[model samples]
Target: QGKEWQENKSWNAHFTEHKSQGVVVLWNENKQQGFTNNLKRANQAFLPASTFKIPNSLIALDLGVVKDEHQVFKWDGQTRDIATWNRDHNLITAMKYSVVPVYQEFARQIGEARMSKMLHAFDYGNEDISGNVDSFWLDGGIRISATEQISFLRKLYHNKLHVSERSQRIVKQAMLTEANGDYIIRAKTGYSTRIEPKIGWWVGWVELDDNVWFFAMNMDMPTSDGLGLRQAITKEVLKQEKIIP
Candidate 1:
């Protein structure tokens, strides 16, 4: 059985104005209702890209791959294109900067068998980690739809996933990008540049006093510069909904 989503055309202008084709799915946790700009694309699966860090972090913590968020992952002195990723990183920094190498190291430590098992348990994407363990999510072997992203996030937000509560809590804290007395925004951005028609993603939830609105957005990036549209469009739609100031 599948849940029906309300088609909202109001958000369509945000995508077309940017010259991208994508979808934004928003679920009201308390109301158990969903809104989407393009339901077809919302149901289509795509690479999780950096968004995998959310669950990968959970698996690492559960498997004891790292002691805690403060556990520092030493840099191997290999310079990356992103300067921020060139140095050592702890969980928070790794997530904030989206350090790929640190996460790749964590995946290698988790190994294929354990990571495969964990994905099945988490019901992540296609439950496929067939190729290299470290790059499956990045390289396009594993794909998850925007709606599925919402489902996975819903589980994590409620601590109902198959991982320890501590693990989920830690990852939740690491995902927090903004917080204040009014509302808290915990989210992640994903980019699959290696894939054709490059896809950019922004997924997370916004917490208000009595409700939590979870959103997942993925857009076709014609140029790297369009990457910023992922969050820009999502925030615009959220503001239109009056979910944020």
Candidate 2:
């Protein structure tokens, strides 16, 4: 079916103000309406970075590579650039810290054959898991557009994916970033530093009662410091659109 997308200059202003260029795709499940800044970039595909964790986690659980959120991943005692990644991690803590090594380990266990099948089944991105299986979503051939990200997220939000409902529920719980009596935000932030002009991403949905709003944002990160812009711009746009207070 054809999905109409509305352009929001006000949302684009947030990116301009941050001196970065990116696209924001927002889809309202209840209204069946969508909003975006740059339609071109919204449709343009880019490496998913850590945002792939969403589907990756689903596949891991589906394949029994990860039993549950509480299963521990022991630290190898090797120092990583990020301080938080040095210690043990389970699905919840790993997702919270965006621990790449843990997910990479999951991918290795999932193997290329199984991972490829899952990607195809999920219809994720280009469904390309070429190059190293462990780092495919990070810097390999896999790519997805902001708009496509919303599509994937929308399915996960509604438990419409092909995976088991229990697996979907666990991953949804892992994505929880903010919660209050009025609204709850479940999201994932991603950064791809191995590529040129690195990219940052924030993808997830906001739940308010019976209505749900899905969003995917990716921005040019000229330097590592610009990583924060991904969420900053996204939240600002969400606030301006009155999707969140």
Candidate 3:
């Protein structure tokens, strides 16, 4: 298969109202077709925010830091901004809620050396976990472009990234947001408060009867919005291509 790149005006018109954003989509086994809204931003690396949880989940399982998705992580009894994180959480719930504290504990348990090694092994962006182990992906020390996000996701989708099948499957199971006879959705949302203007990310893929379309969407949100423009824009683009009904 060959790679094709083009401006998706429909997507552009749909996303332009947002003021600032980037999206990259790759389809088929070998990236035969691709579309990008902002080539520069799409190729630029930004902190992955919670989206890194996808890979973090894989590493936790494969390393035995977490026995299984059902293993419970007792609440650390610390107060936090988010109410949902105040209680115990298993892998599935932690993922579903995007509980930062739970996964922070996971990172601490995995330790710096092991986490750094695995990130390098996966070639996850710059693989720099030099900042605080608990908040590296949240702040600095790690970054990934939308393009690389799709690339890494494709590897995960095909189980070709050197991680164990069990690890991959477990993480995928945790990421499933919805499914029906027509389509299955697996994705993670990332919100970065550290950067100026702030940013939000929704990275995942759509699995249909005959194909998988991977997407990574990031938008500058003056602040977190109740409106999920990331998914809105991506979903519209996906539908225009008939990737989902």
Candidate 4:
């Protein structure tokens, strides 16, 4: 768990070689930051894709609107112009598939003001969400840096944000189940399609025994394969480091 993933994967994601001229990777617990070419040019306010879903779900859970990640909601199954197929609107179903509608409903119920206050109160540091038109998080205003992302991950674990600890637990627990390997993976993958110059992301922490590690990565790739590749490399690094039991 303490093994560094972004630090190791940065070289391979080949961020610098992509269209994005800016790239930065950071590990909070490790106190290390990696960059493709330069860190100075990086914007600390880049809006997230599905990565923003974390706070949305956390807020819903804290407000008791969602009992848990497995909670269910009735979805009309009508396509809301999302790239993925639209069907049932349940927490785990939405989260597992990163459904934009489910999260949008939660966010809107919380209201723009509440969400803004929560983000600010939680030290999210950026108001990146725009007006929700359909079943999607409007990605015009929300933005964040890879460096700040690492910082946020620490806050999420430490419960420094005003978000309820119980809610955070629910969110964290749900993420833990995303593991496709033997190692304990507590992660959230994101992709910003509406945002200009589409971005792909994988950000979260991992735990195995006494070791605990945090990671946040984003790439300007057209496909979701970037995150899958990142996770695969992460598993290999953990295996090579024996981070897994």
Candidate 5:
């Protein structure tokens, strides 16, 4: 939605084997310098998986469905296919582990009408919630492109979205991935096999002294080994651009 961009061939060359992958990275406010591996596909919509949690969390917090990151979601004791999701979780752990049920519960509490309204307000993806309310993002009913992700994230980083500043702050704090003297990274990882061949996503932003850089990477993962591919490719590109150490 910004402009025609150049590809960082050297940064993404090693990942050419992915064949159907795309990534978009931009300076948060300075749109002058940006890159995309496959410009067309970067605008192509795909299931957001756990990445949807980014907005989902914001919506829940704004709606008061959650009081704070410490609000605990008691375990139902029903074992999940993923062991990590089987335990009780607060917002922080739920986000850190990508715990599905906790967020799903938040959706059930948000209900469809309000969730749909929020989606439209944020101009998220297709804003389609016609499927099961709690499972829409995972079931492929909600779709967001890598390009849209960068834009959406930029809004979140700046607190420009309609949500409350407190809600935005809470969600961003939950997304913190790493922090060192020079830079702080706040991000999320999402993987979905709901569609064929599976898709992996690593989406988030990095805050340096003068600028915040938002990034989104999606790739085809024929197998489980590709779970790390999104971040790996993203890191190389970030390094190539000297956004991080």
Candidate 6:
């Protein structure tokens, strides 16, 4: 439901009450802007998370590291940790499953310096290291506001990120999909455990007939874990937006 919109000050007012760490909303399709806290934060900084893999997979495809074969992309059933979540996966599997360790390998090769460079080259998140790289887990990773996130989504949807065609295929199949009829949605979700608790996030872009909308829903709980409920909330959001029938 990332479309241009009729104004809703009531909705805007509601966001003003969500003043926790930060909240910034840019309704790019509608040219609307809202914030509960910080307003000037750039989208160019923040951990790309599993979402980064969307483009990283594209890069791998472009490099001819392996042929255009998702089938050939197999894993050792190896696993690693990003916080408390340990997953057994490989590159493509990690992405399909959002497995952290598989992507971590890519990050290790890309390193903090190069990964950051690539992200910057794309005019992506500003939190820099080397090239899509990282030392501390979140180093090369950082935040992208709804505005900048939407910008990238548009390019991804058009398959115009300037990489080879194979990379585009991986991205399209893994991220963008048609769930009902002609409505299109590209989405990624991520969670992190730090300090004593955790922060879970859901971010995605949706496209329907004449509308394309981007959403980033970040939720935190002191003690409650809403794995199933969180999914339901995301689905509900999509359903109510009429992006999916």
lDDT of 3 by residue, 155-195 (tens): 89888876799999999899898799999989999888885
**lDDT per residue as tens, model 1, 1-245:** 14669989889998888777889999988889899998899998988989999989999999899789999999989877899998989999999999999999999999989988988988887988866888888884788999999999999999999989999999999999989998899999999877675899999999999999999999988677888898889988999889898
What candidate 5 gets wrong by more than 4 Å, as runs, is 1-4, 17-20
Clashes of 3: 0
Residue 234's lDDT in candidate 6: 46
Count of backbone collisions in candidate 1: 0
Q: After superposition, how far is residue 135 of candidate 2 from its true place, in Å?
A: 0.8
Q: What is candidate 6's local distance difference test score?
A: 0.51
Q: How far is 37's C-alpha from truth in model 1 (Å)?
A: 0.3
Per-residue CA lDDT of model 6 for 1-245, tens digit only, reads: 44332333333333334432323232334444322223343232345455666666665566554355454434545454343335344444455567565555555665455555556656654544443353333343355554466566666666667777567767666764336676666667655553323444455666667766665544453433553433455455455446466
Q: Estimate each model's TM-score.
A: 0.96, 0.96, 0.93, 0.77, 0.93, 0.67
Worst 10 residues of 1 by lDDT: 1-10
RMSD of each: 1.7, 1.6, 1.8, 4.6, 2.2, 5.3
TM-score of model 2 vs. true structure? 0.96
Candidate that beats the other on lDDT, 2 or 6, i.e. the better one: 2
What TM-score would candidate 5 get against the native? 0.93
Local accuracy of candidate 2 as per-residue lDDT tens digits, 102-146: 999999999999999988888898999998999999779998999
Task: Pull out the clashing pairs in model 1.
Answer: none
Say what the RMSD of model 6 is. Answer: 5.3
lDDT of 4 by residue, 1-245 (tens): 44433234344434433433334353435444333223542344566667777878888888777887666777756767665536665666677678876776777678777777777777774654455623334456667766667677778888776877888887877666455445466777777776677766677876645556665666566765555655554444344545564
Model 3 per-residue lDDT at 140: 66
